[PDB]
Ligand binder design. Structure first.
Ligand SMILES: C[C@@H](O)[C@H](N)C(=O)NS(=O)(=O)c1cccc(-c2ccc3n[nH]cc3c2)c1
Ligand SMILES: C[C@@H](O)[C@H](N)C(=O)NS(=O)(=O)c1cccc(-c2ccc3n[nH]cc3c2)c1
Lengths: 402, 395
């Protein structure tokens, strides 16, 4: 259905006229935002990606150097500072190039994979802006791979595999596209043809069917564009793999090669899997219809006292799950039946409802019910925490509590 | 001794003329950056603080409503978009007011504490910019507490406790100042007096010597300001607890008790992650405590026959999950690799020879060159987890 509506109703996020094309993520929405980042970071840690932090604001001269100013000026927020033109970054690459270039580099560091969740700004038109789908502010799960010519093949394979494992945690399939030199391109047509050839070859050595997106490459290189299929039937433009021979020439990037070859230029692969956190929250909100899987759920645990004499104990249980990092709420409202409250928490999409009466208070236990109304019965607080930690850590689908 | 130099030498961060007043954090500096945010996060979870994500650019009308356009205009970066005026946020507070105002509020959800690590920008003069001390872009460990009048006393107590517990982890003492209304403020003098009286009171309920600091308050409220004293004995301004009666009026904020005004407490403890990073880089002279060090373990084989075993050991510490490196370089002696790792500031060097490979152990040398003997991998892992989890200093 509609992410804007669900995000509003579930108290995840909202939009305000004083900041069009940006989003206000309420506590429950920020939890989803951060869990998506943690998910990506945890993959980075097994794949040799290293997170960095960069500026948001740069002198126009940087954008001139990178050719962003020439090709991409329509889309940037510029202002002046002590009589010099500055602009909010729309992409992280040029910053990353300064980082590669900061000190001399050795072949031994390659591939160098720099990741960045920094906030980007693109000046889309007022009337084109919509929800989390077309925006002015976003954070990508961005990274730039700086590598040698001989590493290109393996790194592209690496990107496709990473992308497959990521979307398989959501349960998503995907389709592949090859995007060709646009008009408004940078550098040499013959260099671009090498770049297109290599992407083509990488596409054919990977399993899958692919189509041509004629003329849709970035100004700096051709790309593999990946559309994801959600559980409903919709395709979304999320991921890219972009082969860039042009920026290294622009920034005069070099590394020291095997001794004694001369210095060479690094190759740059731009990539993003989620695309932007914002776009991906949109997609997921609609995909699950608010029925979040446990690790993504900002409603993990509802604690329900049987009656008001078990209130304080319910508060204790709720605090314990809270302190163990779960999104845990409590329903003390005396006006409704136990069964009504269980049903409400279930309609509000809580994964686990923990019922607490006298007998549970006395023994430090909980009576477990799931979202889909499965009864698992009595377990201690600690064992419940332990088992729920596994389900979260492994990012599964929680009809598996046994 | 200077964070800029240490940062350069340790490959933590550097600065560039193309973005004066903003920092480039290399992977090892970015590690430190995030470990600090993580530390604060884990305290938030224990103390009923709820993190949010907000926009960075807002239509100028919001800054007019908040009182920022009249009082902070010059300190802000502004630009036009479709014939309208926008500006990058210098503070999170107005966005939080919008969030609080998004739907009617019940006294039962108060105190409501909104935490935000968003990027702030303020326009400092170029000639006053220095490393991580005076900057244009920064992330504060900011939060705004929305509470009832009769709740102020406990919350400010809580803010004091939060403060002590954090600074105690670093090992810092601190002193307290009261910042009085400045010139060019908003609201009634009378209400201000009322806000100053509550800060005065709580300031000596918390039985600690405190100083007056005339006219240094924010335009929206009086401040408890806090300087910390580091290990070298230098004082730094970091933490602030600000009592705000004005923004609730300005934003027409009410809650259902009938319909009263919330009180806002602005608060930060680290100040900015940037500033605290400068302070910590200098405080230690580059010698990171284990929980903050991005160079926690260096694995060193004794010769090439132990390369594969050293690899396997490093991978186990990496997986466990430490910042674990390895030095396979065949043209440096064992003693040179150890010396190098120690000068690079690794907390522990794990020496791995033929004995160690056979036994599934490690031989450990500390940063300051003390032997800790042969140890099993899993006991060394447990130890280092303790050091990390409890954020241990030099004991
Ligand atoms: C990935 C970054 O490092 C790169 N510097 C960039 O900003 N690229 S991008 O803005 O053009 C970008 C980012 C994310 C997704 C896409 C994109 C664009 C079009 C697509 N069709 N199918 C999948 C698609 C993906 C493009
Ligand atoms: C908490 C937010 O709502 C507030 N808008 C803010 O940004 N505060 S602030 O910019 O004034 C600020 C932030 C961090 C530190 C200080 C500060 C300022 C002066 C000080 N003297 N001694 C300790 C001090 C601390 C001020």
């Amino acid at each position: 259905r509609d992410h804007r509506k669900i995000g509003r109703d579930q108290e995840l996020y909202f939009f305000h006229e004083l900041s069009p094309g940006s989003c206000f993520f309420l506590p429950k929405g920020a939890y989803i935002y951060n869990a998506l980042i943690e998910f990506i970071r945890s993959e980075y840690r097994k794949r040799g990606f290293q997170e960095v932090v960069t500026p948001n604001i740069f002198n126009s001269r940087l954008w001139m150097t990178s050719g962003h100013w020439q090709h991409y000026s329509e889309n940037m927020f510029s202002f002046e500072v002590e009589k010099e033109l500055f602009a909010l970054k729309p992409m992280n690459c040029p910053g990353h190039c300064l980082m590669f270039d900061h000190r001399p580099r050795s072949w031994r560091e390659l591939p160098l994979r720099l990741a960045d969740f920094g906030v980007l700004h693109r000046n889309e038109l007022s009337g084109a802006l919509t929800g989390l789908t077309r925006v002015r502010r976003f954070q990508q799960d961005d990274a730039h791979i700086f590598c040698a010519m001989e590493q290109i093949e393996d790194e592209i394979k690496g990107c496709l595999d990473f992308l497959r494992t990521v979307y398989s945690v959501f349960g998503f399939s995907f389709k592949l596209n090859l995007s060709t030199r646009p008009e408004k391109f940078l550098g040499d047509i013959e260099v671009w043809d090498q770049a297109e050839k290599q992407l083509e070859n990488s596409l054919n050595e990977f399993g899958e069917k692919w189509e041509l997106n004629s003329g849709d490459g970035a100004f700096y290189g051709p790309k593999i564009d990946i559309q994801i299929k959600d559980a409903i039937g919709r395709y979304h433009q999320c991921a890219t793999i972009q082969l860039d021979f042009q920026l290294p020439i622009r920034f005069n990037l070099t590394y020291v090669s095997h001794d004694g070859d001369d210095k060479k230029r690094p190759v740059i692969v731009h990539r993003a899997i989620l695309g932007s956190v914002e776009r991906m929250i949109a997609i997921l909100t609609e995909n699950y219809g608010g029925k979040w899987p446990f690790w993504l759920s900002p409603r993990q645990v509802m604690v329900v006292p049987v009656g008001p004499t078990c209130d304080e104990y319910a508060q204790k249980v709720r605090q314990q799950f809270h302190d163990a990092k779960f999104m845990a709420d409590i329903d003390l409202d005396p006006g409704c039946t136990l069964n009504k409250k269980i049903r409400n928490a279930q309609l509000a999409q809580y994964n686990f409802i923990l019922v607490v009466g006298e007998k549970e208070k006395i023994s430090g236990t909980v009576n477990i019910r799931t979202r889909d109304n499965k009864v698992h019965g009595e377990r201690t607080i600690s064992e419940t925490i332990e088992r729920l930690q596994q389900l979260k850590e492994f990012r599964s689908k929680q009809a598996e509590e046994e």
